[PDB]
Curated annotation (Swiss-Prot), chains A, B:
Its EC number is 2.5.1.18. It catalyses: RX + glutathione = an S-substituted glutathione + a halide anion + H(+). GO terms for molecular function: glutathione transferase activity. Conjugation of reduced glutathione to a wide number of exogenous and endogenous hydrophobic electrophiles. GST isoenzymes appear to play a central role in the parasite detoxification system. Other functions are also suspected including a role in increasing the solubility of haematin in the parasite gut. Homodimer. This is Glutathione S-transferase class-mu 26 kDa isozyme. It comes from Schistosoma japonicum (Blood fluke). It comes from the Eukaryota.
Amino acid sequence: MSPILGYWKIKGLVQPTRLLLEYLEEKYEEHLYERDEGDKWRNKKFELGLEFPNLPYYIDGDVKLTQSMAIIRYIADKHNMLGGCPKERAEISMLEGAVLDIRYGVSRIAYSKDFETLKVDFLSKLPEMLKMFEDRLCHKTYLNGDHVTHPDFMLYDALDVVLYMDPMCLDAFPKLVCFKKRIEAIPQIDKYLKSSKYIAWPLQGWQATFGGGDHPPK
Amino acid sequence: MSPILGYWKIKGLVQPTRLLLEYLEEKYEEHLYERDEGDKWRNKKFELGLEFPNLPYYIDGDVKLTQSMAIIRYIADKHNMLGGCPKERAEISMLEGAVLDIRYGVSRIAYSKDFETLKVDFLSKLPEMLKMFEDRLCHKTYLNGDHVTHPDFMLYDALDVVLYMDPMCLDAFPKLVCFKKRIEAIPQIDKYLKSSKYIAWPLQGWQATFGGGDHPPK
Ligand SMILES: O=C(C1CCCCC1)N1CC(=O)N2CCc3ccccc3[C@@H]2C1
């Protein structure tokens, strides 16, 4: 039957998996927990059969899985998108972790009261990270060529996210901008983003110092 | 010719890759940068041919690679250790990210002046993370059975590391303790740990609030 994807009803860790499932035109159900609903989760937490209980979880009946990167790589794996030979698979994994750099970087410093003096710091590093993708896309449509791999949706979510921190960070990175529009112009992604299903906010969990609330940026 | 592994001469991100190379009895050379030696790196940084310049890097001549997880998964991949089918590969990736939870968790909070009020926090979560591995090993020799996979050396390094934060954190987790002794009793790991090659400290980069210096714990 339909896979279950469970996470908080935020963007957070699972957003790229959602966009990949949407792109692959795959059926899945979600358990979203809303913010009053910790208790819900803590209960079910250990009755679900996960060996490493966590959120997000992905249950299949081939598979019960709890790490966001194990989940997105599995879905991709199931569709042959993962690699191809050690070299190609390493390519994709290096792209993966090159965008976690950016995205986990937001997250390190969201939740600090010190966010604001932290922010200024992390924005000095951003453009050097960005330039690396911009250079990558200087001759490709997608991160790995003419074909969407899972890290393209990781990068879309990173870009989506760092644009709330500093709406000007992609002036200067015109390929990166077009890449963004390009993902939004895939018709499954277009549909989904118009969907009742699309969770537009928060970026992180509701309590965080940036991306939280049910809000506005910074 | 021999692969090059470049990192700071600390344990840090690359320690599990080193132990895997050692276990697989593979030849590699390292470029270690010492602490006076930022400038060294920044120079070479962009003359090395890495598409995403970073440390650690791994150069092969099939491959120039810069994300620690892309590097260790490649070396493992090259030796067939990675997976086997989408399900098995997801198993290994979930174990991977279940131990980054612990290890990146140290790292989040090393480098803060607030480490000490941060420490107390993170130690409340540790035992719940630990219990998950302890339960996992309750019937296996290694994380995935009777055979070492790359996440076993990830877990060894995590354990090695959280033992400096709280030398008592594994009283209570006797399987975890034996797993540690068990990795140290593999003869390639035994040799290496006795080696001139073994970098015993620092755990993180020299400037960090825990695991830094050329030191003692906490
Ligand atoms: O614990 C982790 C793991 C959890 C398991 C799956 C892998 C990551 N973290 C979570 C986290 O918040 N950060 C802070 C930001 C950051 C930046 C660079 C490198 C690492 C990190 C870590 C990664």
